[PDB]
Structures are given as C-alpha cells and as structure tokens.
Amino acid sequence: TNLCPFDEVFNATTFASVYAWNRKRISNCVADYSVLYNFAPFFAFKCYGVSPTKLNDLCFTNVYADSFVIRGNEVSQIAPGQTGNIADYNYKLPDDFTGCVIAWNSNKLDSTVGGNYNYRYRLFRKSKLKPFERDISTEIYQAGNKPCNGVAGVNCYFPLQSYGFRPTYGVGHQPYRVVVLSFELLHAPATVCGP
Amino acid sequence: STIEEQAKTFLDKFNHEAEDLFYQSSLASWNYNTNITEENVQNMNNAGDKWSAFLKEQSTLAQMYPLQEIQNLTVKLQLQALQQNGSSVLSEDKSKRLNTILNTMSTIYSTGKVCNPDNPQECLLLEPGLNEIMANSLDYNERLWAWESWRSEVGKQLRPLYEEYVVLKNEMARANHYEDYGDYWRGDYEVNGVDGYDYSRGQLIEDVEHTFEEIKPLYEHLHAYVRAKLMNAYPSYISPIGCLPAHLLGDMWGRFWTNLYSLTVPFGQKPNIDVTDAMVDQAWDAQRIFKEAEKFFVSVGLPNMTQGFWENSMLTDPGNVQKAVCHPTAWDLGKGDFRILMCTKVTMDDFLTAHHEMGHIQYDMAYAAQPFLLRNGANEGFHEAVGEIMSLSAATPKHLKSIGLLSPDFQEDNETEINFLLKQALTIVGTLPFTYMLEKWRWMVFKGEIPKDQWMKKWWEMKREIVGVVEPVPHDETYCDPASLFHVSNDYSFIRYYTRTLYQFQFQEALCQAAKHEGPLHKCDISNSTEAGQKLFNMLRLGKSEPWTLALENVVGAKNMNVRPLLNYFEPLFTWLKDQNKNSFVGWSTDWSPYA
Ligand SMILES: *[C@@H]1O[C@H](CO[C@@H]2O[C@@H](C)[C@@H](O)[C@@H](O)[C@@H]2O)[C@@H](O[C@@H]2O[C@H](CO)[C@@H](O)[C@H](O)[C@H]2NC(C)=O)[C@H](O)[C@H]1NC(C)=O
Ligand SMILES: *[C@@H]1O[C@H](CO)[C@@H](O[C@@H]2O[C@H](CO)[C@@H](O)[C@H](O)[C@H]2NC(C)=O)[C@H](O)[C@H]1NC(C)=O
Ligand SMILES: *[C@@H]1O[C@H](CO)[C@@H](O)[C@H](O)[C@H]1NC(C)=O
Ligand SMILES: *[C@@H]1O[C@H](CO)[C@@H](O)[C@H](O)[C@H]1NC(C)=O
Ligand SMILES: *[C@@H]1O[C@H](CO)[C@@H](O)[C@H](O)[C@H]1NC(C)=O
Ligand SMILES: *[C@@H]1O[C@H](CO)[C@@H](O)[C@H](O)[C@H]1NC(C)=O
Ligand SMILES: *[C@@H]1O[C@H](CO)[C@@H](O)[C@H](O)[C@H]1NC(C)=O
Ligand SMILES: [Zn+2]
C-alpha cells in the first residue's frame, strides 16, 4: 500500500515565504492521520466544513498542502472572512473553504541571533487578492501621481519587507509554521482515502 | 491619490522599519547594561547611530504632508512627532556650539570636586561625600561649608555657559515657530483639534497657580511644624517667625525633606512598620518577591507576566565576574520583549520597588497594540503616577497581613498612622513648592521678564516668597544657583513631578471609590478588586491615541487636575497639625535673613 507522503510537507528543512507559498499535490495514496498528531504542540487545529473525526472515512479527489511561516499575532488571519495584511495581500481563503489549518511554534529552527531576514511578506499592493492566487512580482509600488520608472524614491517604495525573526521576541512575534489543507471533489471517481 | 493615502502608506512603511531599528538599539543597550565592556560600548554606539540617522532621514522625508489637509487625528499625531525639527533649524556653527555647551555643562556637573580649607589633598565630590554630609550631619558649620562650596566652585563655571545656552535655545525655539523654550516645553501638554478637550499651552500655568493656592495652607502648617521642631536641634540659628535656612533641609538643594524624620518624629517611642526581619526569617528571595508582586497584579484582573520575562531578565547582582549598573529600570525593548533590571535584596524598599517596576511593565504591556510613535504615556506624568499608585497599596498593613507578613494580632494604633502620614508628607508635600518655583523661574527667564542682571535677585525673592527658604549667605550676580541642580545643568523638564504628584492621588481616590472602600483614604488596598482593575486598564491601553484629558476622564471622571484628593489623603495629619500649632505662628516673614 502506497501511504500518503505526509512526511515531507510537515517535516521539511526550510519552508517557503508567505508571498511564495508552495503547493504540493497529494493523490492516489492512503491516509496517515495518526502520524499527524506528532509534533504534539499545536497552536491551532481548527477545521472547517468537515469534522476531524469523520475525515478518516471520507474519499475525495485531490488534497493540496500549502506551507508558510507567519508571526504569532497573525495566525488568526488564516481563516475565512478575515481582513489584514496577510489576508488581503499574501494569502486569501474562500468563504466556503473546506479543510483544516495547522500551526505550531518554530522558534527553534526558524530563528537566529542577528535576524532571520530570509522570510519576507508583501506590505503594499494596488489591488486585493482573489482567493487562492499567488503573486511573485517585484515592481515598485507607486504611492503618488508621479511615475517611479522602476526606481526607489519619494512616494516610491519596495513592496516586500522582511520579518527578521530573533529568538528573544514574544509568542506573537515568534515564528509559526502554518500548513493548510484543502479538499476538492470533482466528477472523477474518488480514490484518495484509506480503508 | 489624496494626501491621506500618501501619509498612511508612509507611516505604514515607517512603522516596520522603526520597530527593527529600535529593537536592535535596545538590545545593544541592554547588553551594555548587563556587561560593562569595551566591545559592548562599541556595539551600543554603533547601533544607536543608525537609529538617529534613520529618524533624521525620515523626518526630512516627512515634511511634504502639511497638517491642514490631513483629517484623522490618529495620523496627525504621528506626523506631529515626525515633523519636529529640533536643533536642525540652526546653522552648523550654532548646532556645534550648542552641543559643545551642553556637553561642557554635563562634564562640569559630573566631574565636580570641592576641597577643604584644611589639608588640600583629601577632598570630595557630590556622590558620595557631599550627600552624606547633607543627609547625616547635625553641625551647622559643616553643612554651610558644603552648601557654599558646591555653589562657589561649580556655580561660577555654568553661568557664562548658561547665558549662551539660553540665547541659543530661545533662537532655536523662535525659529521653530514658537515663542520661547518654555513654550516649547509646555507644548507637551498642548491639545487641539478635538472639540471639548482642548488645552492651550498657556492654560497649564494658570492651572498650576490655581492648584498651588489650595495647596498653600497645608504646606504652611507643615512648614510651621518643621520650624518648631527644628529649633531644638539648632537652638540659636532659626527665628520663630522667619524662613527655614537652605542648608538645613536634609538635602543639598532642599528638594526633599525626607531626612528630617529623625528630628521631627511625632511619637519617637513607637516603632514603624518594617517586615525585613519577617522576610529574612521566612527564607524569602527575589523570586518570591516578584511572584508576590505578580499575584498582586493578577488579583485586580491584569494579566500574567510573559514567559520570556522570567528567563531574559536579571533580578539579582551577577557577582564579581560580571559588572552591571544597579539601577531599577523597566525595559520595553519592543516586539514582545519585557525585562526588569534590578539588583534585588531582601528589604521592604525592594519589595515596594518591585511593585513600582512591574506597574511600569504593565503600563508598557497595555499599549503594545498601538502604533510605534503612540506607544507612550498620554503626557509626561502617567508612568510614575501608575508606579506610585500601585506601590502605595503594597505598604498598607492589611496587604501585609494578607501576604503572611506581620503578626495577625497586630494593633494598628492611631499614632503609627500619624507617623506614616508625616513621613509621606515630608517627601510628597514638601517638594511641590520647590518644583513650582523652579519651573516658574525658568519660564520667566525664557520669556524675558527677568533681565540678565536680576537672575539671582529674582531667584532668592521667589524662594523667600513661595517656598519659605532664605539663603544663609548673600549671592551676587556672578553665581548661578539653579544650575547646580542636575535637571538644570542637563537639559530636562521639571514640572512633570508636580503634575504626577497631583495625578497619583486623583488616581488613588478614584480606584478606592471604585473598590467600595470605607474609611480614611490612606488605609486603602486595591487588591481583590476587578472593577478597580478594569477602570485603570481602560486608560492604560490608550497610550497617546487620545488626549490626556480624555485619559484622565476615563478613570477619575474629572476634566483637569485637582488637589482635593491630595488634601483628603492628608486630612488626619492636617487636623493634627492644627491641634499642635495652636501656640505657634503659622506663616513666615520675608524680611528676616540669617546674615541680617
Ligand atoms: C484576596 O482573596 C483571596 C481569596 O479569598 C477568597 O476570595 C475572596 C473574594 C473572599 O470571597 C474570600 O472569602 C475567599 O476565600 C484571599 O486568600 C485567602 O485569604 C484567607 C485569609 O483569611 C485564607 O484563609 C485563604 O486560605 C486564602 N485563600 C487562598 C490563598 O486561596 C486573599 O487573602 C485576599 N487578599 C486580600 C484580602 O488582600
Ligand atoms: C523644519 O525646517 C525646514 C528647513 O530646515 C523647513 O522647511 C522649509 O520651511 C519653510 C517655511 O516656510 C519653507 O518656506 C521652505 O520651503 C521649506 N523648505 C526648505 C528647503 O527650506 C520646515 O518647514 C521646518 N519644519 C517645521 C515643522 O517648521
Ligand atoms: C522529522 O525529521 C527529523 C530530522 O531527521 C527526524 O529526527 C524526526 O524523526 C522526523 N519526524 C517525523 C514525524 O518524521
Ligand atoms: C484613521 O486611520 C485608521 C487607520 O486604519 C482607520 O482605521 C480609521 O478609520 C481612520 N479614521 C477615520 C475617522 O476614518
Ligand atoms: C497566571 O499564571 C498562573 C500560574 O502560572 C495561572 O494559574 C493562571 O491561570 C494564569 N492566569 C491566566 C489569566 O492565564
Ligand atoms: C558577560 O560576561 C563577559 C564579560 O563580563 C562576557 O565575555 C560574556 O560573554 C557575557 N555573558 C553573556 C553575554 O551571557
Ligand atoms: C488616639 O486615640 C486616643 C484614644 O482615644 C486619643 O486620646 C488620642 O488623642 C488619639 N490621637 C493621638 C494622636 O494619639
Ligand atoms: Zn518609576
């Protein structure tokens, strides 16, 4: 039996940034919900649409795993119907989202003295993201009426800022690795489910 | 895009950046304060320069959003903070001269030594030596020698510098669209824009005189009592109808009358309330003290301390290998980092200082959600007010009984209450006239009502008429007596102490009324009162987002400063002073001087 490889999307070395969240497909496998309760400390295991207990005896079409790390006081924005810098400009979920959100503290391997400026988020954007959309653009945000012509300067700002995690911040500024799972059902026959 | 969006975006980018730079500066300063080493000094100096450079650059980049097109009052205070010009309005030569004058005055104050008329190799400085003489000596001549020497071998060297400093600061204030430097200082209390909560810069003065008029009688009675009991230690040196000489007040400048408790004790026989022996015999340490103080704050609804507070903070002297500055301070590094640096010992004073510092920490934690520039007290007199009001309840005998100290069959007599009230009055009520006189003198000097050739004459006339203190030796126009104080040699404000002293008792009265307390106000404990915690937290969380008038109204229900709560606290002492002063003269005469 080919088990679902939920061992590389939950235990990788380096996770993606907020503005470049990775998406890995999981299909044609057998569920391993038991090992999911490893890494016992969970800051959140909120689920939507379906109950965690009944997720075992359910067959779907495709399961998507999205991974990124956000600060402590911003985990609340990973949920339907939320507004904020993370929700509007980085990651948006639909109002009818079905799945679970998993978050746990990571201030042991995602922080360093001096600052971990390898994780960055989008701060300014002209529009607001529609649900499930990425944007790896790096143009200069025009905050005025005079064109910037792709350089920095008055009323022209770089869109991406860097967190700078340090291992002495609080439980709201400390890093938190967040993995969200989405369940979709299509006209194709259901295959992704265990015994 | 209107100016509103352009200002909002600029502030939104400034407030991520400032957070990182301030954190790294605060971490460097904390590392220096824990380890006094050359490498740490280098890191502190190298990290406290990027902050200044970035602040100046953003202030220069924030002058293009005029404050008449912006209509949000939350974005108009950040721009007010960021648009201050300071000393940048001056030329390069003027700024260099001002910095040199300030540094020279600070150096002369710090490294200042007076030397004896006797053998000239052994001679002292202020700390220690010139404070031990002023605090623990009963000789009339030695105190006079110290008082005259400090103002003779230091005061001469600041007047030529203070003249140019006054001129340059007035020119800078006028260039920054003000009236003088005193108006610049008063601008902290200025509120405009919000209807019904305005406060002009000139109204602060009038409020100060209005409060001092009501404060006058209690201070006059206390002055008469201190004069009456101070004539026993100096039988032939104090006039029954005159003013108290300046070198007999228990302090170098007479700021506090605390060191007169040994000479002016109401009932000497009865001890005071001390729990040092009880703490020692119960095996108490710094951890126990801070846990009890934490339980005190938990009892009123305020939250716990952060887990990082216990691990990242130093509460005991490291020892001999490490060298640190043993000054009790509360640190708000930002981004969730709260630390307390204090060399705790097993003493009642440290027990109260722990509550004071944790009150500061709670105040800092309250407004962590506000923007960076608004993360401060509403005015310059709330942080100490909160500390003192939270410290006051800890010294009550009932709270001591609650925490298992002091025997549970203690008889709280009606004489230890008088002793405690007089001890509190010697340090709370005896400093308001001094602060008022000093601030009024500096304000009049800045405005120009006092010409340059009348500084000392006006200073001594004001001290004689307001405070009730007469100089022991005549002073000409060559001395500069006010500059001998730390807060005058180093550029600092002084009315914040008066303002905080009036604020603290208003806060205490409001919280005790909210706690359903019955009896005298000085027997009040706010423990086990959720309402008194919510009422305070409603103001603690605002920060600078709202004017100080609204913040004061949110707690005390009033609109401005008041002195009735202060005089209610000292009411039994006031009645006792009337009872004891029946056969004495209440008041002083300006004419009498010791050298007349
Ligand atoms: C603050 O209150 C605690 C808890 O007391 C309880 O809650 C009160 C509101 C009231 O309803 C009491 O009757 C309750 O017992 C006090 O702690 C108790 O103190 C008494 C002293 O008589 C002691 O016998 C109990 O064992 C204590 N309970 C504990 C430690 O859990 C505390 O003394 C109060 N602090 C004050 C009044 O300053
Ligand atoms: C701070 O100082 C700068 C100059 O150092 C001021 O900028 C000038 O202000 C005057 C005032 O009318 C204008 O005429 C100039 O056009 C401004 N720019 C320059 C380059 O001179 C600035 O206004 C000052 N800030 C405040 C709050 O007064
Ligand atoms: C996660 O990876 C680490 C690194 O080798 C390993 O020690 C640990 O056992 C892994 N945990 C799981 C649940 O796979
Ligand atoms: C002021 O700016 C803040 C910043 O978001 C905004 O929430 C608030 O609504 C603004 N005030 C008004 C009256 O619109
Ligand atoms: C504060 O800490 C104590 C002991 O750690 C705990 O019992 C209490 O529940 C905490 N308070 C809150 C509000 O969590
Ligand atoms: C502080 O102590 C010494 C210098 O006194 C220093 O070498 C050491 O690294 C410091 N300890 C810390 C930072 O924990
Ligand atoms: C204290 O109480 C006693 C007993 O009533 C009374 O005689 C005395 O005047 C009161 N005041 C003082 C200061 O002792
Ligand atoms: Zn304080």
Residue numbers in the entry:
A (entry chain B): 333 to 527
B (entry chain A): 19 to 614
Paper lines:
Receptor binding and immune escape have been recognized as two major drivers for the evolution of receptor-binding domain (RBD) of the viral spike (S) protein, which is responsible for receptor recognition. Receptor binding is a key step for SARS-CoV-2 infection. In this study, we evaluated the binding properties of BF.7, BQ.1, BQ.1.1, XBB and XBB.1.5 RBDs to human ACE2 (hACE2) and determined the cryo-EM structures of hACE2 in complex with BF.7, BQ.1, BQ.1.1, XBB and XBB.1.5 RBDs, respectively. As previously reported, the binding interface of SARS-CoV-2 RBD in complex with ACE2 was divided into two patches.
